[PDB]
Amino acid sequence: PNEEADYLGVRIQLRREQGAGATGFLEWWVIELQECRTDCNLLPMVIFS
Amino acid sequence: PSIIPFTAQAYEELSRQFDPQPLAMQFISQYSPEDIVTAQIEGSSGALWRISPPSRAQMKRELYNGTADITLRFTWNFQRDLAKGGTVEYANEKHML
Amino acid sequence: WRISPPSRAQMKRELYNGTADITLRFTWNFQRDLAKGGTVEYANEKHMLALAPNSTARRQLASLLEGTSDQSVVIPNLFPKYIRAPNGPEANPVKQLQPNEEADYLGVRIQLRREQGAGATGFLEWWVIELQECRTDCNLLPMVIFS
């Protein structure tokens, strides 16, 4: 009911596999919910079809 | 598989969470447990970030030194089964901070 | 194959030590020209083999992830050669050409290609699939589609 103010905060991280050498950077982003307690690797989006 | 339909327990748990909001309960009561799905979106990006080194250097300059607002756009897009009916395969929208 | 190093380590653990069946899903999806007519742009379906715990195929696909073996895994019953693409999104295999259903599906030989560049752990990894009975053009999987 507060629209944007009821949307969950997202914790964003940059994962940077390098392989300990050179600038070969396997880079990808990870997102987590700010209040994750169980399954921080999952963002449960509840969809009413 | 990541798309999990609501169990009767998950529907009772959602109803409980929203029992204080009569407008939320009026909305929840319009949908069946089969109509509500949890998409368990994995929090690791399913693609490597292919950003060009000059695009990354520009993004870094725009984050530190950019005077204009940089729009963080979160988008969702739902593909549906046209063989189950309806005229629209893709339902999508965007949030923009 | 963009798989995260922890996802690859988990897949390797699930292939070697997983007690649950690991589902090998082969999917096909046919895009059609809506300007030629019909109401359905995409006709799709899925085959799903349960790779049983301790099975030969599950262990050989586990050893491929080690990159110590030039050995291909053969997975029987995986490739439906004959598929109907009907006016709807149910791209069903042809039970009239494959009367034993899964038992008339071609075996797929799977390989892991691992370009390294002779140095470090920079691993350009991708999978190759071949038909078990390929004689000519082993780099091609002829899927026969009845539209």
Curated annotation (Swiss-Prot), chain B:
It comes from the Eukaryota. Changing residue 16 to Q: Found in Er(5-) blood group phenotype. It is found in: Endoplasmic reticulum membrane; Endoplasmic reticulum-Golgi intermediate compartment membrane; Cell membrane; Cell projection, Lamellipodium membrane. Glycans are attached at residue 65. Expressed in numerous tissues. In normal brain, expressed exclusively in neurons, not in astrocytes. In Alzheimer disease brains, expressed in about half of the activated astrocytes located around classical senile plaques. In Parkinson disease substantia nigra, not detected in melanin-containing neurons nor in activated astrocytes. Expressed in erythrocytes (at protein level). Expressed in myoblasts (at protein level). Pore-forming subunit of the mechanosensitive non-specific cation Piezo channel required for rapidly adapting mechanically activated (MA) currents and has a key role in sensing touch and tactile pain. Piezo channels are homotrimeric three-blade propeller-shaped structures that utilize a cap-motion and plug-and-latch mechanism to gate their ion-conducting pathways. Generates currents characterized by a linear current-voltage relationship that are sensitive to ruthenium red and gadolinium. Conductance to monovalent alkali ions is highest for K(+), intermediate for Na(+) and lowest for Li(+). Homotrimer; the homotrimer forms a propeller-shaped Piezo channel with a cation-ion conducting pore. Heterotrimeric interaction may occur between PIEZO1 and PIEZO2. Interacts with PKD2. Interacts with STOML3. Interacts with TMC1, TMC2, PCDH15 and CIB2; the interaction may be part of the MET complex. Interacts with MDFIC (via C-terminus); the interaction prolongs Piezo channel inactivation. Interacts with MDFI (via C-terminus); the interaction prolongs Piezo channel inactivation. It is linked to Dehydrated hereditary stomatocytosis 1 with or without pseudohyperkalemia and/or perinatal edema: An autosomal dominant hemolytic anemia characterized by primary erythrocyte dehydration. DHS erythrocytes exhibit decreased total cation and potassium content that are not accompanied by a proportional net gain of sodium and water. DHS patients typically exhibit mild to moderate compensated hemolytic anemia, with an increased erythrocyte mean corpuscular hemoglobin concentration and a decreased osmotic fragility, both of which reflect cellular dehydration. Lymphatic malformation 6: A form of primary lymphedema, a disease characterized by swelling of body parts due to developmental anomalies and functional defects of the lymphatic system. Patients with lymphedema may suffer from recurrent local infections. LMPHM6 is an autosomal recessive, severe form manifesting as generalized lymphatic dysplasia. Belongs to the PIEZO (TC 1.A.75) family. Piezo comes from the Greek 'piesi' meaning pressure. This is Piezo-type mechanosensitive ion channel component 1. It comes from Homo sapiens (Human). The gene is PIEZO1.
